[PDB]
Symmetry: C4
Subunit: 337 residues, 4 copies
């Protein structure tokens, strides 16, 4: 029996947030910092919950040192060496509280990560990523990492439904990475037919996490600050971004109209440059992106957009955005000429 779910699954383009009444005079009143206490690691975090994705070109140390100035976060890419990290530590000690070390489920990866966590005790976040986030093999791996590092906060993914968000949390992960399909350079939908609309995946997964006192990252699929806001509005605790951060000076890669090469974690460009075949669910794209320059401007644009959103729905802090969010269903997002 092949069956078809009756419920149309919407994405970001299919909706808008409705404005509401409030006493908020203007957007600089709004506080975008959140304070979280994690279910399993028992650690506490405070910052602006926007994470740079652990992709080759954007999850760099340079990107980190800027984000951190804004209390934002960076999931560092897994190809840096131990020596690379010990220089990062020496150079930017104040940044270590705002980064996560990354690993796949392979033994070599686990060992290298371990050497990093031991050499840099200030790093207190771990980001774990596989091709099939629904595998029992990932479940037992998450148990292993939890046992090895009982006081480190664990981000794990990726999934799109709530049964697997609960199983991953109950198996020791703190923050589940929700998203398969929508990523700017993800090709699961084309290559495999498998995936989920981003908005629907957050609505559905956020509820499942929060009943366990766990948390989620909306990973992928945001194309402008409005999407970030919708992602938060849908219940996401953090939002992670690759494509919106691609193209800047603090991105790794030469400038080539000035452009830069933006490529997926499991892309052909990636496999050539490195053992990444089964790191993500699809062999992602390799695109050319216009050179945007310094990431500060982009950060300002994004945070500013999000402050307005909160103001316009009556949220004085980011914590209250999902509480105040009413989405309306629309037939369009743009007025063309």
């Amino acid at each position: 029996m092949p069956r078809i779910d009756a419920d149309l699954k919407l994405d970001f383009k299919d909706v808008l947030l409705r404005p509401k009444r409030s006493s908020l005079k203007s957007r600089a009143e709004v506080d975008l910092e959140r304070t979280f206490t994690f279910r399993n690691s028992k650690q506490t975090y405070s910052g602006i919950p926007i994470i740079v994705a652990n992709m080759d070109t954007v999850g760099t140390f340079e990107m980190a040192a800027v984000m951190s100035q804004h209390s934002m976060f960076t999931a560092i890419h897994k190809h840096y060496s131990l020596d690379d990290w010990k220089l990062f530590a020496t150079n930017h000690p104040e940044c270590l509280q705002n980064v996560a070390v990354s690993s796949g489920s392979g033994q070599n990866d686990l060992e290298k990560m371990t050497s990093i966590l031991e050499a840099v005790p200030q790093v207190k976040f771990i980001c774990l990523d596989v091709a099939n986030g629904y595998s029992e093999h990932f479940v037992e791996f998450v148990k292993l990492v939890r046992a090895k590092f009982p006081e480190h906060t664990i981000m794990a993914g990726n999934v799109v439904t709530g049964e697997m968000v609960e199983e991953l949390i109950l198996s020791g992960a703190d923050i589940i990475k929700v998203g398969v399909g929508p990523g700017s350079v993800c090709t699961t939908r084309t290559k495999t037919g498998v995936g989920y609309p981003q908005l629907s995946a957050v609505i559905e997964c956020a509820d499942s996490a929060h009943g366990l006192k766990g948390h989620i990252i909306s990973d992928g699929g945001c194309t402008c600050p409005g999407d970030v806001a919708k992602a938060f509005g849908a219940g996401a605790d953090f939002v992670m971004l690759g494509g919106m951060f691609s193209g800047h000076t603090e991105c790794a890669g030469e400038v080539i109209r000035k452009l830069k090469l933006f490529y997926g974690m499991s892309s052909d460009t990636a496999m050539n440059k490195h053992g990444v075949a089964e790191y993500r669910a699809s062999e992602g794209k390799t695109v050319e992106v216009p050179y945007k320059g310094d990431v500060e401007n982009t950060i300002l644009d994004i945070l500013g957009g999000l402050r307005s959103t909160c103001t316009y729905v009556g949220a004085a802090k980011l914590k209250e955005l999902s509480r105040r969010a009413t989405f309306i269903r629309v037939t369009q997002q743009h007025n063309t000429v």
Copy 2:
């Protein structure tokens, strides 16, 4: 609890007006003038209820002097000086009954407006505009302007839902400006995720105004005369337009294929040229538009379109259009080659 309204919100593209039986021989029979009596100012107005928007390039004095010849209206941009206005008065006294002076919620703006209303008693309309039309701060500001000018008619905005249309009317505004998102150079949807489909916003807001014996302007989102007609058909008492009036000789700005620069009230181009950051809900676009020449032709095209609409639905006067309007839901608006 993030929730999603079950009702799909349609816009202008999603519908058509149905023709109906009548005794109307032709479109020159139709009278497009309306006579209004305002709830709070208690003043009476007669004209063709189509308003040029208070944008830098289109809300000019030159635009005004043409519109006025057609009994149309112009919301003048807020950057003109007192001296500029006193020349407008001297030069085009017969036009003063067909313009509104504009202001934001800042004290400097209020003072400059006040000096203008005192120096030109013939100006009897006020247009008030903010970034967050749902703020309690806007509500109290509207009370202040009402108290300062008890015999001036007040347009205030912008909103998209009826609870705020009622609160603004009950707080002293006469005519509520309805529209957030659809404007040709508005970027709220992209930058903030917040907005509303224009047609749905008028249907919903018109009902709310009219129960209080108040009035609304459909502000933004019309791309052709058909949209104007639909806007009126949905219940709007006036319709305001920026983009359809952009590009003409009576527009402010040099001619540059001949083009002209059309930019938003809170756009980057605006901030550079002037203190406009929080005048509108978004930092609007700056587009190039083809030089259309004299606004008379455009006016003729638009009024002509609207006369046909009334004829085809059986409305001998514009007053009867919403009464006679049945919208049908469609899957398209164009026959491509």
Copy 3:
């Protein structure tokens, strides 16, 4: 009260015809000729019910002489003179049974038509066209033409709903022309907001005609032979076409890549060349179309397509197509690369 009909109105793109079981070996078995007896004129017609539209460039005498060889029909454009027609009669007497003379509702038009019907008794069809097919003025005009020519068959239009199809038939018209909006060079939707999806307009109007033993033409909106088939399948008794016949050698106008100018009946190009302002509901477009050459090939393509349709649904004659038509609702019509 502005209201919105709950029923989504589909067009040709939104549907497909379902194949069905039959004993039909192949498409040359299918007979596309119909025999009609008209309600009010009491005349009988036999032919392939596909009519060339009465547009300047396609409703020519040259087009007629080809169509007629295929038992197809031509609604001749209203600008030809009496002398022009008397040469047509002399030259192509066998074609006169397959054409209609055209007129608007003006007295000059009526007189010129009258002179034509008197000078050419073999012409037994009249085509009457106005801007507002819902006007009481059109209703009384139809009564007048019926009384003046009691044995001529009258095509009248255009409408999209059944209440007006019945009133026009009961007022003496034989064949109602159904379609407002979808025409290739019609601009009602853009200029006035008024119109109707073609498929929905035929479904709805065909039922209304046939209960009175009257007939309809699906006028406008077909872009390929599939649309013709759907139009017939929806219940239409005839289908009229402009754009699909545009571009051929037998079209009026010079060749200019080789192109030809195709323009609407009430278009600016039309008004310049001639008193046509209120002949159709909109001031239609003027497009450039590629030179297709001889209309024979196009005719062959269209008739062939329609024979296959009948075969694939089990209709041995065109009469049985609507009887055998089941439409399925689809989300697309094309497989792009």
Copy 4:
């Protein structure tokens, strides 16, 4: 009575497959081979159920010799001669178990096929194709072929609904070819208005076959490996492909940016090169396609995609994919820049 089925018929773009929990470590665990026993021929087949379509350019002997190395299948085009086939047999004896000989319903075709089956007893599949797969003439032809070759497995088509799938199976065909409209170079929808969405046609037809212990091919409409997976997920026993195999070295036709000419079975290019008028339901297109080079890479890409799909839904073998398939309804398939 023209009527409209209430059920919207979805295609591949309208859905995604949902990931599910499993114990599958990775995609090389998945077995894509199936073992089938046919209802009427009583023969058994084992291989990867992906068939190259019997089109001029892709159903070649060269294509066959590669496919066969991958346990894939090739429906050979019907224009090869007896002598051509006897060389194929001599050269690639091990491939004969993985090809089908093709024929239309004409006597010449039947005779030539017969001479081939007699000269090459190793060929045990027959592929039969007509313009109207719903004709009683096709039904009796299928009876004739069954009687002539009682131990050959018969693929017959094409249809889209289950009443005709059952009648063709009960009349002796083994494997019904399901698909009319979606094919990359099919024009039925444009030329005739007749067709069916591919996904809906498989869902509906698969059920009908399987109740008779028969089988179906999803013929046409796949544009990437995701579509293949969805096709299998919907219940299809095999999937046939033309366009995805077009463009390779083992395709027939010269290289011309390097391109190759890809044309339909009943296309104008086909009729010119050969008696094919009524072989398929439409006169298909002739497109230019980029030269992809060797078909091995494409095969690897497609099989790899399909292994991931099975892994991500928890299917260790292709047999279990439809059993494990839950489709979700979506509003999009792509993230544009």
